[PDB]
């Protein structure tokens, strides 16, 4: 009955880009499932901070470029779970088509798993050079200033991670909108195992 999931969340941009975390996501982040929250920055306001604090007993936050009066937030953070070191930062200009730049940040923090909050607000993950890279997207679906494909809009998302030993299971939660305004939570699972 122990909480066992790590919430990875970021790029909320409340209130300047978005007003709220979607109610369908708040339902999923109810008390007692999440053991730790990694927040990758850009909250930005106090109400949003207080809400994230309420999700879990262990909130670890890094500073985003829009968290302007946030001197008490570190620019990077590293948590250890099982045999894995998990580092994170806002890293808003990091991109997966330049994976060596992400790798250099992972080697700098010296971690197995690197989470970053790329400014494109697209969820993605990939494995590279025996490491795992995770961008949770924007949990509010905040607009991006990056280049979107023609019919593309930002998809609200966050991730939950289950770490056991050298293995990490990642669940991504996306609020996908249909052509008719309807929407639904869509879940996908990804697995990473650190090579021996």
Describe the structure.
With 196 residues, this protein is mainly beta. The chain has one domain (1-196): Purple Acid Phosphatase, chain A, domain 2. It has three helices and eleven strands; from the N terminus they run E-H-E-H-E-E-E-H-E-E-E-E-E-E. The strands form two sheets. A six-stranded mixed β-sheet has the order 3-2-1-9-10-11, covered by helices on one side. A five-stranded mixed β-sheet has the order 4-5-6-8-7, covered by helices on one side. A hairpin with a 2-residue loop joins strand 9 and strand 10. It is globular and about 50 Å long. Belongs to the VPS29 family. Residues 5-145 form the Calcineurin-like phosphoesterase domain. It holds the Pfam family Metallophos_2. InterPro entries: Calcineurin-like_PHP_lpxH, Metallo-depent_PP-like, Phosphodiesterase_MJ0936/Vps29, Vps29. Keywords: Protein transport, Transport.
